[PDB]
Design a protein around this ligand. Structure first.
Ligand code: HEC
Ligand code: HEC
Ligand SMILES: [Zn+2]
Lengths: 136, 136
């Protein structure tokens, strides 16, 4: 019932990025430059398929330094992870939710079995609980 | 003598990202959110391995919108492309330089054989004319 650390996620398909700046409703703790990654099975669901068990989405969050009108990636702050298993993660709509502080496998951030993560993703039920949209 | 359109570059390894905002000296035309991608041969050279001929780096440049203290990816502005061929592109340091407007294969931008591109990259001679560094 624990989400697996997604080893090698940095080699996956880059879905999209976004910058969350101070004042954003999600600043604490989602502030920074983030990058969304999808493994092969998550790409099937992003394309309009059903998400197969074993699909994984990662959101990779960096601090940034504002220097002379550029935002430059600093240290990794954390990753968020969604792992598809319709049966094992039935209590959170079929996705297991975990955070890893600094992207480190032993820094688990989720303390409520992912109910809080799931509560916000629940608004996205019609897209199988995923916010991010596939773009060219 | 021409740089190939890098078909499928969106599936390649994501090296890094940066945001260039108004006031930045490079705002015209490099303003926006950009993502750097590297094919297998480029990853060899970024590793502290010497770039094989056939190495390709892509810089993918999006306009962004302000959305309540978030910077959100907008329309693609252009891609910049560096293709490695020590002999064919010897006049610009072994890299061929091309731009594609809106990332469209039919909207080639470079008119001077890439001498303008090369002139800015020349300051990176000690890293084989590549600015971007590999990161975790
Ligand atoms: C709202 C109050 C949220 C809470 C609580 C959590 N997340 Fe989040 N997450 C949120 C948004 C608006 C987005 C989209 C960002 C974008 O660039 O469009 C995300 C994104 C993710 C992702 C990427 C997949 C996706 O659904 O787009 C993952 C893997 C993710 N979030 C994980 C995650 C976890 C594990 C959470 C609890 C620790 C969590 N999120 C909380 C908004 C919100
Ligand atoms: C300075 C005056 C530049 C000119 C002219 C051009 N480019 Fe550029 N480029 C520049 C910087 C500072 C960077 C690094 C951005 C970052 O995030 O660190 C880049 C990056 C690229 C890349 C990525 C590979 C790399 O060297 O890091 C490519 C493929 C690239 N640029 C292509 C390119 C082309 C085709 C140009 C002329 C049309 C060109 N660049 C001009 C700065 C400058
Ligand atoms: Zn405000």
């Amino acid at each position: 019932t624990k989400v697996k650390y997604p080893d090698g996620f940095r080699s996956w398909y880059h879905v999209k990025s976004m910058v969350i700046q101070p004042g954003h409703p999600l600043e604490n703790p989602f502030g920074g430059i983030h990058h969304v990654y999808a493994n092969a099975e998550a790409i099937q669901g992003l394309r309009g398929g059903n998400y197969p068990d074993g699909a994984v989405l990662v959101v990779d969050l960096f601090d940034y330094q504002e220097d002379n009108h550029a935002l430059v990636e600093g240290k990794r702050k954390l990753i968020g992870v969604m792992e598809r298993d319709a049966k094992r993660f039935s209590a959170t709509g079929g996705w297991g939710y975990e955070g890893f502080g600094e992207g480190k496998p032993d820094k688990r951030l989720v303390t409520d079995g992912g109910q809080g993560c799931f509560g916000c993703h629940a608004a996205q039920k019609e897209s199988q609980y995923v916010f991010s949209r596939l773009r060219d």
